[PDB]
Amino acid sequence: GDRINTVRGPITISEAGFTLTHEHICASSAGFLRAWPEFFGSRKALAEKAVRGLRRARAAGVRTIVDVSTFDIGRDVSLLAEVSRAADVHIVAATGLWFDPPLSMRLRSVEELTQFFLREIQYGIEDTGIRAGIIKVATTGKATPFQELVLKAAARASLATGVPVTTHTAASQRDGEQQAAIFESEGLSPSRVCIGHSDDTDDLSYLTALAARGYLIGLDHIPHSAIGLEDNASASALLGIRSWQTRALLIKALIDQGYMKQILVSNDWLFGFSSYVTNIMDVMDRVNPDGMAFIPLRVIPFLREKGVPQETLAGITVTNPARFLSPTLR
Amino acid sequence: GDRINTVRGPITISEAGFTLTHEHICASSAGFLRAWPEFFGSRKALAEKAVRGLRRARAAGVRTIVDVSTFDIGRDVSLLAEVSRAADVHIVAATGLWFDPPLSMRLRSVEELTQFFLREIQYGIEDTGIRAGIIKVATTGKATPFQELVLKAAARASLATGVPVTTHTAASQRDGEQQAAIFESEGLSPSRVCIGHSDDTDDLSYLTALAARGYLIGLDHIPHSAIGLEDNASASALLGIRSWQTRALLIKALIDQGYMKQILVSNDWLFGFSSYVTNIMDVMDRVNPDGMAFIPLRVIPFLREKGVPQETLAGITVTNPARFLSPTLRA
Ligand SMILES: C[As](C)(=O)[O-]
Ligand SMILES: C[As](C)(=O)[O-]
Ligand SMILES: [Zn+2]
Ligand SMILES: [Zn+2]
Ligand SMILES: [Zn+2]
Ligand SMILES: [Zn+2]
């Protein structure tokens, strides 16, 4: 556990630096960007845009982002490597499955899925040699049967490799509780696990109860808000109507209850988005022109102003990610 | 239309020859073959197996196959081009959408889908320049609202390019009737359309009505007979108990009623199958070891033995596919 795999190769733990742990270059679907790149203008336009945003995040102090796009989010690790080199920002790539698995995934056993995630972690994604550094999974409410298999296989792959697991939840449904039960049924340590989208809820008791058990709490939706666009239903459905300040005060709340070491903060931002309504990216970029720089430009100052010490901010944004990403065998 | 697009470039209508009109190299899912080729042993092993199979079909007289794998069947057009060249069989690639569209597809409008189909027909699939020569679509019962957009977009793409459409049906639910209604609502001529897996039904009159209206009838499940295999529930669920002979006799029934011009026959065979239970292929290859050669080796001789004349059999296997695939604008 002394090296993190990025899309440009292994980096030391101290090279990671200021890290965003839940981001995407592009949220799409398996095969889609290569089949229909004109949906994003062109592949070149998408890449140029990503590099712009990554360069601006780098200017604001971001050294590493974790791209948590799985196979079924249309992860294109060749694009990641390209924009990582061009922008000079480390990108950690993901294996796992999110909630749009095709038939050839859906029909697979826990054992088969375990071999797939291990392939992507140990040997490399597709034919690239680029090894994942994290496993993403997802529920949206109670796990479907397949989703239980995915979580169990993610737990098996993490135990074999030391690589952490990170989750999508419907927080309003307290998904993290079922996710934790499943992971613990496989003997996975809660410190290997980030329960994500957790700022979608204001149920602080749900959150501290998980952190108390050792889970990392991913407060990765801070800039996601449809305030001012409440008449755009597709945006409000996606973003919620809770303000960024409300979401950020959960970070303080967790800190005040003694759980600073369990917190991971991010934007869940992206430069293309095909797996929602057309032209959604335009809406999102109007909502948050800072994009991935929103955390270092708006959130960290806001917290500091509300009296969060520098030291605690550095812990959350540098230390916790390093601990989380360092591959760590039981 | 003077030329049919294949994965090696345009061919003349006469180069097409004996043609299987509903086949796959590999039935999978978008991205899946490239992310997890070890599911098939390796990509190399899958290619080699497809080449052997294509070479045996070529030996039995097959000159061209139409790989009706869409984006969401995990069509890998580079793989098609590779095995076409190595086996020396023409392969026609497909555009369209089958019944496993991802979110980024399912969320698209008829206009967007139309543009995507046109892209794969007129400009080329992915970055390859390989152009589709057919549009595959699917329902499994009453069309879902997304499947209606797909069928409308297919019809618009076919009207604009002359390239035909071919369908997956649940035959027992008479899917072909709604598919036809949708295509006609867009002004597509029936002679552009093949209603596939139609040998899955015993309802002859459902078939003859569609043929009368000018539709091609795709009898492409001839070897899909789960016979002596109720021990295997997903395999007998895949296949069925109706004998291959019974399915072939539907070809003869349509001929006898005067619709030899409307008949397209194929195997719907494949060399890999990830979108089903694991090891389904071993089951399938043990059932039909002739593979894509089953049509020329078993079916055509059986029909001749039943009294079907040579010229009629040439018509169905050479002339109907040529007419179907040759790009034809309306009026
Ligand atoms: C890939 As997502 C839209 O759940 O951040
Ligand atoms: C792709 As298929 C199983 O409907 O021939
Ligand atoms: Zn998510
Ligand atoms: Zn995300
Ligand atoms: Zn089918
Ligand atoms: Zn088929």
| DSSP conformation letters of A150-218 | HHHHHHHHHHHH---EEEE--GGGTHHHHHHHHHHHTT--GGGEEE-SGGG---HHHHHHHHHTT-EEE
Q: Which of A246, A251, A269 is nearest to A261 (CA)?
A: A251
A293: number of Cβ within 10 Å: 23
H/E stretch holding B235: helix B233-238
- CA-proximal residue: ligand 2, atom 4 (nearest): B168
Residue B123 in contact with partner chain A when CB distance is under 8 A: no
For CA atoms A176, B104, B74, B43, give the dihedral sign. Answer: negative
CA B5 to chain A, closest CA, distance in angstroms equals 18
Cβ of A119 within 8 Å of Cβ of B38? The answer is: yes
Task: Count CA atoms within 13 Å of residue B296 on its CB side.
Answer: 21
Q: How far apart are CA B209 and CA A242, in angstroms?
A: 58
Q: How far apart are CA A210 and CA A214, in angstroms?
A: 7
Buried b vs exposed e over A103-140: b needs ≥16 C-beta within 10 Å?
bbbbbbebeebbbbbbbbbeebbbeeebbbbbbbbbbe
DSSP bridge pairs for A64:
A19, A90
| Three-state DSSP state, B135 | strand
Nearest to B274 among A35, A36, A104 (CB): A104
Residue B130 in contact with partner chain A when CB distance is under 8 A: no
CA B16 centroid distance within chain: 16
Q: How far apart are CA A103 and CA B169, in angstroms?
A: 18
Q: Which residues of A touch B30 (CB under 8 A)?
A: 29-32, 35, 102
Residue B289 in contact with partner chain A when CB distance is under 8 A: no
Residue B38 in contact with partner chain A when CB distance is under 8 A: yes
Cβ-based neighbours of B244, under 8 Å, separated by 6 or more: B222, B223, B225, B294, B298, B299
CA A117 to chain B, closest CA, distance in angstroms equals 10
Buried b vs exposed e over A196-214: b needs ≥16 C-beta within 10 Å?
bbbbbbeeeebbbebbeee
To test the contact with chain A by mutation, choose from B103, B140, B276, B277 the residue with the greatest count of A C-beta atoms within 10 A, namely: B103
- The tokens for B322 are 């040529």
Q: Which of A48, A265, A291 is nearest to A282 (CA)?
A: A291
CA A107 to chain B, closest CA, distance in angstroms equals 6
- Tell me, what DSSP letter sits at residue A126? T
Cβ of A275 within 8 Å of Cβ of B103? The answer is: yes
Cα separation values, A88 from A51, B96, B121, Å: 9, 39, 38
Nearest to B277 among A36, A100, A107 (CB): A107
Find tokens 């990554």 and name the residue.
Answer: A54
The residues lining ligand 2, judged by C-beta closer than 6 Å to any ligand atom, are B 27, 73, 98, 168, 268
- The tokens for A109 are 């056993």
- The tokens for B59 are 């030996």
| Composition of chain A by helix, strand, coil, percent to 5 | 50, 15, 35
- The tokens for B324 are 């179907």
Strand ranges for B164-265 from DSSP E: 165-168, 193-195, 216-219, 263-265
The residues lining ligand 1, judged by C-beta closer than 6 Å to any ligand atom, are A 27, 73, 98, 168, 268
Q: How far apart are CA A221 and CA A234, in angstroms?
A: 17
Cβ of B104 within 8 Å of Cβ of A32? The answer is: yes
Kind of pairing, strands B193-195 and A263-265? unpaired
Ligand nearest to the CA of B68: 6
Q: Which residues of A touch B121 (CB under 8 A)?
A: none
Phi-psi region of A268 (alpha: psi -120 to 50; beta: other; left: phi over 0): left
**B287 and B239 in contact (C-beta within 8 Å)?**
yes
Counting DSSP H helices and E strands in chain B, the numbers are 16, 13
Q: Which of A120, A122, A123, A192 is nearest to A151 (CA)?
A: A192
Find tokens 């197996």 and name the residue.
Answer: B49
| Three-state DSSP state, B240 | coil
**A17 and A102 in contact (C-beta within 8 Å)?**
no
H/E stretch holding B324: helix B320-325
Residue B272 in contact with partner chain A when CB distance is under 8 A: no
For CA atoms B159, B160, B162, B164, give the dihedral sign. Answer: negative
- The tokens for B323 are 């007419």
- CA-proximal residue: ligand 2, atom 3 (nearest): B27
Gap from CA of A68 to ligand 1 centroid (Å): 9
Q: How far apart are CA A311 and CA A306, in angstroms?
A: 14
- Give the amino acid at A231: D
Backbone angles phi, psi at A109, to 5 degrees: -80, 160
Q: How far apart are CA A175 and CA A100, in angstroms?
A: 17
- CA-proximal residue: ligand 1, atom 3 (nearest): A27
Find tokens 């889908």 and name the residue.
Answer: B113
CA A267 centroid distance within chain: 9
Gap from CA of A104 to ligand 5 centroid (Å): 15
Q: How far apart are CA A191 and CA B148, in angstroms?
A: 47
Cβ-based neighbours of A69, under 8 Å, separated by 6 or more: A24, A25, A26, A27, A28, A75, A94, A136
**B153 and B114 in contact (C-beta within 8 Å)?**
yes
- Give the amino acid at B164: P
Q: How far apart are CA B236 and CA B320, in angstroms?
A: 31
Q: Into which CATH architecture does domain A1-330 fall? A: Alpha-Beta Barrel (3.20)
Q: Is B90 annotated to bind ligand?
A: no
Q: How far apart are CA A2 and CA A13, in angstroms?
A: 6
What residues of A are labeled active site? 22, 24, 136, 168, 197, 200, 221, 268
Gap from CA of B30 to ligand 2 centroid (Å): 14
- B289 burial via Cβ count (<10 Å: 0-12, 13-18, 19+): exposed
- The tokens for A110 are 């826990």
Q: What is the 3-state secondary structure (H, E, C) of A221-261?
A: CCCCCCCCCCCCHHHHHHHCCCCHHHHHHHHHHHHHCCCHH
Which CATH code fits B1-331?
3.20.20.140
Cα separation values, B206 from A83, A293, B173, B215, B248, Å: 56, 62, 10, 12, 17
Q: How far apart are CA B14 and CA B3, in angstroms?
A: 9
Backbone angles phi, psi at B186, to 5 degrees: -100, 0
Counting DSSP H helices and E strands in chain A, the numbers are 16, 11
What residues of B are labeled active site? 22, 24, 136, 168, 197, 200, 221, 268
Cβ-based neighbours of B63, under 8 Å, separated by 6 or more: B15, B16, B17, B18, B19, B89, B90
A28: number of Cβ within 10 Å: 28
Q: How was this structure determined?
A: X-ray
In angstroms, what is the C-alpha Rg of chain B?
18
- The tokens for B117 are 């189909």
Q: How far apart are CA B146 and CA A265, in angstroms?
A: 37
Q: Which of B28, B74, B92, B25 is nearest to B270 (CA)?
A: B25
**A176 and A153 in contact (C-beta within 8 Å)?**
no
Backbone angles phi, psi at B138, to 5 degrees: -150, 140
Nearest to B116 among A29, A36, A276 (CB): A36
Q: How far apart are CA B122 and CA B120, in angstroms?
A: 6
Residue A127 in contact with partner chain B when CB distance is under 8 A: yes
Q: Which residues of B touch A29 (CB under 8 A)?
A: 30, 102-105
Task: Count CA atoms within 13 Å of residue B91 on its CB side.
Answer: 32
Gap from CA of B186 to ligand 2 centroid (Å): 26
CA A93 to chain B, closest CA, distance in angstroms equals 14
Q: What is the experimental resolution, given in Å to one decimal place? A: 2.0
Q: Which of A298, A310, A249 is nearest to A269 (CA)?
A: A298
Between the CA atoms of A288, A289, A292 and A293, what dihedral angle is there, to the nearest 10 degrees? Answer: -110
In angstroms, what is the C-alpha Rg of chain A?
18
- Give the amino acid at B218: G
First to last CA, chain A: 11
Cβ of A127 within 8 Å of Cβ of B34? The answer is: yes
Q: Which residues of B touch A234 (CB under 8 A)?
A: none
- Give the amino acid at B171: A
Q: How far apart are CA B265 and CA B221, in angstroms?
A: 8
Q: How far apart are CA B310 and CA B126, in angstroms?
A: 41
Backbone angles phi, psi at A11, to 5 degrees: -120, 155
User: Where do the structural domains in chain A lie, given as residue ranges?
Assistant: 1-330
